[PDB]
């Protein structure tokens, strides 16, 4: 008399197949790429030109002496 089949309690689990967790698509990408890229170029011309100012300063001490 002690056999298995239970009265209730069932799901089931799915046979489904989906995980569309997107994801900033469709022209939202290529937008964070370009602006941060020119931001790095914007970081230039305030350092290389600044080091160029120090570069003439470095060559200044050479020319002032040597007579």
């Amino acid at each position: 008399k002690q056999d298995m089949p239970p009265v209730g309690g069932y799901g089931p689990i799915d046979y489904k197949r989906n995980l569309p967790r997107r994801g900033l698509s469709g022209y939202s990408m290529f937008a964070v790429g370009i602006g941060a890229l020119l931001f790095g170029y914007w970081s230039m011309m305030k350092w290389n030109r600044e080091r160029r100012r120090l570069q003439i300063e470095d060559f200044e001490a050479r020319i002032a002496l040597m007579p």
């Binding site: 089949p5 089931p12 799915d14």
Partner: protein, 108 residues
Amino acid sequence: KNFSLRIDELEEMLTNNRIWRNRTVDIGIVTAEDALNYGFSGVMLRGSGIQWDLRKTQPYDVYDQVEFDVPIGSRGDCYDRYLCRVEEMRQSIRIISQCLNKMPPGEI
């Protein structure tokens, strides 16, 4: 009840990936009537084309009294016999969740 999450893992691991797709597309394109004159059985059959199986044209036991479908892929390569096996495991979960509701007590 906790298995379809594990098959959703390998979907992220292989299906949407490109390199493994690039590793197997258009490889083993055998689709003609010599794909059946060679006497092949299932997958490397019906997933390449010809719909036929021994699972609902020929009974075994109480096996027709459950509901399911059989996968078919598009072309006749390995990647369209690979995608039988993802859907095939998505059928055995249904059948087990259908078989448990229908068992009577009895003898052995």
